[PDB]
Design an enzyme around this catalytic site. Structure first.
Site, PDB file in Angstrom:
ATOM      1  N   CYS A  81     -78.984  15.375 104.213  1.00  0.00           N
ATOM      2  CA  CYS A  81     -78.267  14.898 105.392  1.00  0.00           C
ATOM      3  C   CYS A  81     -77.825  13.476 105.054  1.00  0.00           C
ATOM      4  O   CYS A  81     -77.328  13.264 103.947  1.00  0.00           O
ATOM      5  CB  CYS A  81     -79.127  15.046 106.645  1.00  0.00           C
ATOM      6  SG  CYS A  81     -80.892  14.422 106.516  1.00  0.00           S
TER       7      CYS A  81
ATOM      8  N   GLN B 129     -87.853  12.869 111.852  1.00  0.00           N
ATOM      9  CA  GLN B 129     -87.663  11.448 112.178  1.00  0.00           C
ATOM     10  C   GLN B 129     -87.945  11.098 113.630  1.00  0.00           C
ATOM     11  O   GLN B 129     -88.078   9.897 113.950  1.00  0.00           O
ATOM     12  CB  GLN B 129     -86.217  11.028 111.863  1.00  0.00           C
ATOM     13  CG  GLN B 129     -85.925  10.808 110.413  1.00  0.00           C
ATOM     14  CD  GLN B 129     -84.448  10.435 110.191  1.00  0.00           C
ATOM     15  OE1 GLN B 129     -83.542  11.248 110.405  1.00  0.00           O
ATOM     16  NE2 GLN B 129     -84.210   9.202 109.795  1.00  0.00           N
TER      17      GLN B 129
ATOM     18  N   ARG C 193     -82.887  15.877 109.686  1.00  0.00           N
ATOM     19  CA  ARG C 193     -82.359  17.250 109.699  1.00  0.00           C
ATOM     20  C   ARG C 193     -82.825  18.046 108.485  1.00  0.00           C
ATOM     21  O   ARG C 193     -83.119  19.252 108.592  1.00  0.00           O
ATOM     22  CB  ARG C 193     -80.823  17.226 109.728  1.00  0.00           C
ATOM     23  CG  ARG C 193     -80.273  16.589 110.977  1.00  0.00           C
ATOM     24  CD  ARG C 193     -78.773  16.415 110.900  1.00  0.00           C
ATOM     25  NE  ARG C 193     -78.347  15.415 111.880  1.00  0.00           N
ATOM     26  CZ  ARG C 193     -77.091  15.000 112.034  1.00  0.00           C
ATOM     27  NH1 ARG C 193     -76.130  15.490 111.256  1.00  0.00           N
ATOM     28  NH2 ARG C 193     -76.800  14.083 112.963  1.00  0.00           N
ATOM     29  N   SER C 194     -82.835  17.403 107.309  1.00  0.00           N
ATOM     30  CA  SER C 194     -83.262  18.069 106.074  1.00  0.00           C
ATOM     31  C   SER C 194     -84.699  18.556 106.189  1.00  0.00           C
ATOM     32  O   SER C 194     -85.043  19.657 105.721  1.00  0.00           O
ATOM     33  CB  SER C 194     -83.150  17.105 104.878  1.00  0.00           C
ATOM     34  OG  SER C 194     -81.807  16.810 104.525  1.00  0.00           O
TER      35      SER C 194
ATOM     36  N   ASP D 132     -73.934  14.345 117.282  1.00  0.00           N
ATOM     37  CA  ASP D 132     -74.083  12.955 116.833  1.00  0.00           C
ATOM     38  C   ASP D 132     -75.396  12.345 117.332  1.00  0.00           C
ATOM     39  O   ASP D 132     -76.052  11.584 116.609  1.00  0.00           O
ATOM     40  CB  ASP D 132     -72.904  12.100 117.328  1.00  0.00           C
ATOM     41  CG  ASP D 132     -71.713  12.052 116.357  1.00  0.00           C
ATOM     42  OD1 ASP D 132     -71.614  12.849 115.398  1.00  0.00           O
ATOM     43  OD2 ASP D 132     -70.835  11.186 116.591  1.00  0.00           O
TER      44      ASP D 132
END
Ligand SMILES: Cc1c(C(=O)O)oc2ccccc12
Length: 284
Positions: free
Chosen positions: A215, A262, A221-222, A181
């Site tokens: 994502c 990010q 994440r992508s 998370d």
């Protein structure tokens, strides 16, 4: 510089935030006018994440052709990817329309439906064989065929039917279920094992349309997934693998979708994944 020693040099000097801010400063800025039209407000999950006009995927529809999705075309590596947000309640039918129209074989999902106590994307595939889904706005039917649950990821076989023509196609759903998370994984081993399973399926190969990867926003994440895949492919193709510059590859991908990677932690994790992956490929 090479990668593994540039890596230790940034760790010892603690300058990951400065390296990442340089990337942000140099990244491309292109217009995203269609994304910002008022009629498309409920088609975007986040107001600050939009596809560029020049690379956005168009739906084959004359009313409204908009979806929050981008085509990332990597010329030297000879790989293409579609990066998209997690589908919203009012875009699940558009999502599967895109999969159909673009001739994709695989869908790669890097988030859980609920994270941090909030919904990160719609439940857009069926969970039981006998309970199929019908998307009336786009005239598609989706059936769960089989499901294989492993410790770090789940693979599903799905059947997508175009109800207008009665044509059917098999779609593979690759679901990475263990990204934490908060932060990034401590080791890249399970993420690399997952990448190799997607590769082995044929879903990334030129005989199919581009893989769809998402994502929640479709940039973090992508971005890590396609950056690691492309860098490892270039290291196999070139005479000098140490010439592959992960920062230059990332800036090339950011010509096609804003915001890829990010955080500085995601940047460090991407280096780690490419470094460890290059040892397993060989010739080892
Ligand atoms: C020899 C080598 C180096 C290096 O010199 O560090 O980095 C690579 C990446 C991929 C394939 C081979 C290499």
């Amino acid at each position: 510089m090479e990668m593994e020693k540039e890596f230790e040099q940034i760790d010892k000097s603690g300058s990951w935030a400065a390296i990442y801010q340089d990337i942000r400063h140099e990244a491309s800025d292109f217009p995203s006018r269609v994304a910002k039209l008022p009629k498309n407000k409920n088609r975007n999950r986040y107001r600050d994440v939009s596809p560029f006009d020049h690379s956005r995927i168009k739906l084959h529809q004359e009313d409204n052709d908009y979806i929050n999705a981008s085509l990332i075309k990597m010329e030297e590596a000879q790989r293409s990817y579609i990066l998209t947000q997690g589908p919203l309640p009012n875009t699940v039918g558009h999502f599967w329309e895109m999969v159909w129209e673009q001739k994709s074989r695989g869908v790669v999902m890097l988030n859980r439906v609920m994270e941090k106590g909030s919904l990160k994307c719609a439940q857009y595939w069926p969970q039981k064989e006998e309970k199929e889904m019908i998307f009336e706005d786009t005239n598609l039917k989706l059936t769960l065929i089989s499901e294989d649950i492993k410790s770090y990821y789940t693979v599903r076989q799905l059947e997508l039917e175009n109800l207008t023509t009665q044509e059917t196609r098999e779609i593979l759903h690759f679901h990475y279920t263990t990204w934490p998370d908060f932060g990034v994984p401590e080791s890249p081993a399970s993420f690399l094992n997952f990448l190799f399973k997607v590769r082995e399926s044929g879903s990334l190969s030129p005989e199919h349309g581009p893989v769809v990867v998402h994502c929640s926003a479709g940039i973090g994440r992508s971005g890590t997934f396609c950056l690691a895949d492309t860098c490892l492919l270039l290291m196999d193709k070139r005479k000098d693998p140490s010439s592959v510059d992960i920062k230059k590859v990332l800036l090339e991908m950011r010509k096609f979708r804003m915001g890829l990677i990010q955080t500085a932690d995601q940047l460090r994790f991407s280096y780690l994944a490419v470094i460890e992956g290059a040892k397993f490929i060989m010739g080892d």
